[PDB]
Amino acid sequence: GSSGSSGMEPWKQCAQWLIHCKVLPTNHRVTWDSAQVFDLAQTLRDGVLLCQLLNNLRAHSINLKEINLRPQMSQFLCLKNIRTFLTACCETFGMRKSELFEAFDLFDVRDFGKVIETLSRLSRTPIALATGIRPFPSGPSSG
Numbered sequence: 566g567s568s569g570s571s572g573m574e575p576w577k578q579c580a581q582w583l584i585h586c587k588v589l590p591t592n593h594r595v596t597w598d599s600a601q602v603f604d605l606a607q608t609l610r611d612g613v614l615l616c617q618l619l620n621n622l623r624a625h626s627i628n629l630k631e632i633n634l635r636p637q638m639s640q641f642l643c644l645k646n647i648r649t650f651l652t653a654c655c656e657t658f659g660m661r662k663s664e665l666f667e668a669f670d671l672f673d674v675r676d677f678g679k680v681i682e683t684l685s686r687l688s689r690t691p692i693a694l695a696t697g698i699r700p701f702p703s704g705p706s707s708g
Contacts, residue, residue: 575678575681575682576601576606576677576678576681579605579681580595580600581699582684582688582698582699582701583618585699586621586693586696586698587621588618589608589614602678603674605677606671606677606680609671609680610643610671610672612632612636612644612645612648612649613632613636613646615647615650616629616632616646616649616653617629618650618684619654619657622687622690622692622695623657623658623692625657626653626657626658627649627653631649632645632646633645640672643672644672647668647672651665651668654683654687658692660686660690666683686701688700688701689701689703
């Protein structure tokens with residue numbers, strides 16, 4: 566249902582943070598205007614990068630070995646990986662379990678927006694800010 570929209574999406578600015586977080590290349594394909602939430606939602610759909618993000622901010626956050634770096638487009642493997650990231654978010658960092666996104670939502674790429682928010686909060690952590698990376702906008706105000 567690709568309908569004409571007006572304004573900046575939360576997935577556009579997100580791309581940046583990722584690059585700075587040492588997870589995506591400065592010349593990645595997600596940085597291209599032609600790109601869309603999907604593109605950025607695909608590179609993670611596997612769940613191989615997500616784990617890295619945390620491993621970048623904090624040390625010993627997620628064991629690369631525990632995750633299938635090479636899922637080879639595997640549903641069973643993929644779904645598993647994603648979960649690993651969701652766990653490390655409460656094991657390594659210790660965030661809420663309700664905020665987290667639904668593994669499926671990401672896999673099937675149903676509601677990506679839900680995943681983007683999950684990161685908006687993490688940034689708050691004393692591990693994400695420490696780096697000094699453009700943190701998320703603090704406040705109830707929408708925008």
